[PDB]
Amino acid sequence: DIVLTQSPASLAVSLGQRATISCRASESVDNYGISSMNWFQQKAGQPPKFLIYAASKQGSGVPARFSGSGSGTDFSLIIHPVEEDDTAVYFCQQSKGVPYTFGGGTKLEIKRADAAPTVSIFPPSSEQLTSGGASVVCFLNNFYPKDINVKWKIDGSERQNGVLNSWTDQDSKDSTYSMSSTLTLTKDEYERHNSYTCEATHKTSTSPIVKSFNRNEC
Amino acid sequence: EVKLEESGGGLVQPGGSMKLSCAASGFTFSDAWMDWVRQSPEKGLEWVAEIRNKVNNHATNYAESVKGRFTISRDDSRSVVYLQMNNLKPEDTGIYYCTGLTFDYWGQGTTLTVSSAKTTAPSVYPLAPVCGTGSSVTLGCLVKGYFPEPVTLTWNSGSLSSGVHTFPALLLSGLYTLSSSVTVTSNTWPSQTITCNVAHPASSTKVDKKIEPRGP
Amino acid sequence: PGPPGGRGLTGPIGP
Numbered sequence A: 001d002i003v004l005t006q007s008p009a010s011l012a013v014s015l016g017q018r019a020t021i022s023c024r025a026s027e028s029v030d031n032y033g034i035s036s037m038n039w040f041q042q043k044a045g046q047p048p049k050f051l052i053y054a055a056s057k058q059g060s061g062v063p064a065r066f067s068g069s070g071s072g073t074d075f076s077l078i079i080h081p082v083e084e085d086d087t088a089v090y091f092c093q094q095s096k097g098v099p100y101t102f103g104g105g106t107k108l109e110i111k112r113a114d115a116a117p118t119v120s121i122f123p124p125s126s127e128q129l130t131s132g133g134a135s136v137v138c139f140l141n142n143f144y145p146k147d148i149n150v151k152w153k154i155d156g157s158e159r160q161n162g163v164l165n166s167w168t169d170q171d172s173k174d175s176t177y178s179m180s181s182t183l184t185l186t187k188d189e190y191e192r193h194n195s196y197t198c199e200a201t202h203k204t205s206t207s208p209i210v211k212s213f214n215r216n217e218c
Numbered sequence B: 001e002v003k004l005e006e007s008g009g010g011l012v013q014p015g016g017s018m019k020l021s022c023a024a025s026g027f028t029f030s031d032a033w034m035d036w037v038r039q040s041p042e043k044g045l046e047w048v049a050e051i052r053n054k055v056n057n058h059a060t061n062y063a064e065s066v067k068g069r070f071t072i073s074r075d076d077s078r079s080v081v082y083l084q085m086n087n088l089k090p091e092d093t094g095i096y097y098c099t100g101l102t103f104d105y106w107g108q109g110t111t112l113t114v115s116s117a118k119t120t121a122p123s124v125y126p127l128a129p130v131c132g133t134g135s136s137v138t139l140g141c142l143v144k145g146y147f148p149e150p151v152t153l154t155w156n157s158g159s160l161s162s163g164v165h166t167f168p169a170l171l172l173s174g175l176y177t178l179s180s181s182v183t184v185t186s187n188t189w190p191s192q193t194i195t196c197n198v199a200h201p202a203s204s205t206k207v208d209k210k211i212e213p214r215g216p
Numbered sequence C: 001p002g003p004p005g006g007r008g009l010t011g012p013i014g015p
Helices: A126-131
Strands: A004-007 A010-013 A019-025 A037-042 A049-053 A066-071 A074-079 A088-094 A106-110 A118-122 A133-143 A148-154 A157-159 A163-167 A177-186 A195-202 A205-214 B003-007 B010-012 B018-025 B034-040 B044-051 B060-062 B070-075 B080-085 B094-100 B110-114 B123-127 B136-146 B152-155 B164-166 B170-172 B175-185 B195-200 B205-210
Touching (some): A004 A088, A010 A019, A019 A088, A037 A066, A049 A066, A074 A088, A118 A195, A118 A205, A118 B136, A133 B175, A148 A177, A163 B170, A163 B175, A177 A195, B018 B034, B034 B070, B034 B080, B123 B195, B136 B195, B152 B175
Parallel strands (some): B010 B110
Antiparallel strands (some): A004 A019, A019 A074, A037 A049, A037 A088, A088 A106, A118 A133, A133 A177, A163 A177, A195 A205, B018 B080, B034 B044, B070 B080, B094 B110, B123 B136, B136 B175, B152 B195, B164 B175, B170 B175
8 A cells, every 4th residue: 555644734824825735655656757646625514625636737727826746755735825715624645556545634724813702601492401401502603723721610610521512623714713612411400500601711811701691590 | 517426325233234326427427437435533535446437347446444345336327336335344434425537526425324323313402592682693503412423404494604603513422412503693683583404314304493582 | 648538637547
């Protein structure tokens, strides 16, 4: 098997700057004077899309800012000038020999100004409560960078069991991330306490953003 | 316009069988070399199988890990590629893409899950704001306790797409949970109705939940 | 190195 090893694993580049992504093959992918190295872009929720073929040749309707170079065992994808929509995972792929193989992928993150999250808190629905479950949800929307900490409190007391955090991939238009944090309880435990709080701590402030409700109110 | 649509994915027990189909159009199908590729978080993108054109004797080839278990075939008169999978294993779980002209064109993919766990329909709960306040208002939808992947979630049947974040599903002791948030201006809701639409093909579940404000 | 054709621009090269 021809093994493709990409580097780096990920990369954060400012708008208008160069992104350089490498791919090393374990043996030569040269083949009748043509290096059989292709590159793909995979945006969130989508299949891989073919960008470059035969190392350096442009796929149909692929923007000029994507170019590929190399031969033998060492290849690169250069993206310049980088735009918001280039947020994606990029894969190299080899057609010299069966089995056809892909690299591990390199994640390109588009850098932008730091942005604090907009935080919203949601008690359990009426419907979920009649099931016997109880889920308290915090959305932390439209922030940068991705790195964030959320802390749940019940009647002031911190709580770590039963919390699940899921981030979106970076947005193609505004370059931000969003995140859901979900505290899952038994209904019985939810109705034993009154005060629910989620505290988001982000790079943008030492002071956390606190969002809260009381089960009694309205 | 090139178009690849794969079907036939879903849940199956370890040791069981499944047949995937790939319908193609927008290129001379009988000349095309077609492949299947799968994707998983563990193994990344894996080429699975190749079937060459009539001029190349419909010659097949396979990834070492599926030899003897998977069979690729094609019906040139219907523009369809098939992938027969026998003695399936949990490591075969993933998203299976049909590709044409080797990897020039790709379908959206169909999800295969190999597990002895059972199909379970989601519960879908509307998330209206706290009982009781800015320029903007954020609503939500919680899809809880389903298996296997995937679900599709839209707002007002696709009409409302900007200001939406749909969060990746996570595993909560055997069952999947996901959320979606939607943010509109305050004059929009509750004046105009906002509905969360959730489909779970594996359980034949289609559910619409209107986001109602909370009564005490 | 004939044209690729059915093989695709990403496919392997012949003869």
